């Protein structure tokens, strides 16, 4: 399965999705800079509308514990 095919379900907790992401990211062998680009970009983009909304409110500069606690009720 390709990294672009990794997406969050409509009922799937973000948490279970983030695990899937760094597992597939774990099978990507690209430069770190590209993998940083993938992190800030693709993760949020394939996140579900309800959490996506939430993550837009965190702004930039956000870290994984704060994202992970931010989308917990969703």
């Amino acid at each position: 399965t390709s990294i672009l095919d990794i997406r969050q379900g409509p009922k799937e907790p973000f948490r279970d999705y983030v695990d899937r992401f760094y597992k597939t990211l774990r099978a990507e062998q690209a430069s770190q800079e590209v993998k940083n680009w993938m992190t800030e970009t693709l993760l949020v983009q394939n996140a579900n509308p309800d959490c996506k909304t939430i993550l837009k409110a965190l702004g930039p500069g956000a870290t994984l514990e704060e994202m992970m606690t931010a989308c917990q009720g969703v």
Partner: protein, 147 residues
């Protein structure tokens, strides 16, 4: 493998059955998963080419992958021979012969020869050259076997 003895010399000692079985069990359980590569790397510490063919030959299952790897090992070996030409004139009595891709793959060399190269001064890291080919070929597999 070739290990250091108490006396302070490098001597060959055989690999252990529960090491062998641990190699088997990893492959059984985690198949093509990436954790296989650090795992391999640890269990290949101080290992010979001969021991590395033993580990590859003792696999059961995943024969499409095992063939892809073989063919990668030969490609990487063909490339060794290409990049490093044979040297000028006859081999010196005082010296031992330079390896080829097939000596690195363990095929054309004997154990005592594999111990000569590694234990001698300067030493040549024929394990580490095969190791990269294995790791490279492991990347090929991992990337393919991603779904």
């Amino acid at each position: 493998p070739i290990v250091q003895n108490l006396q302070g010399q490098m001597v060959h000692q055989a690999i252990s059955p529960r090491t062998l079985n641990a190699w088997v069990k990893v492959v059984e359980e985690k198949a093509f998963s990436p954790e296989v590569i650090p795992m391999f790397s640890a269990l290949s510490e101080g290992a010979t080419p001969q021991d590395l063919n033993t580990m590859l030959n003792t696999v059961g299952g995943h024969q499409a992958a095992m063939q892809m790897l073989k063919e990668t090992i030969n490609e990487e070996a063909a490339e060794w021979d290409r990049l490093h030409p044979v040297h000028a004139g006859p081999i010196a009595p005082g010296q031992m012969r330079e390896p080829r891709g097939s000596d690195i793959a363990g095929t054309t060399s004997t154990l005592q020869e594999q111990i000569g190269w590694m234990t001698h001064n300067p030493p040549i890291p024929v394990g580490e050259i095969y190791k990269r080919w294995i790791i490279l070929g492991l990347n090929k597999i991992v990337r393919m076997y991603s779904p």
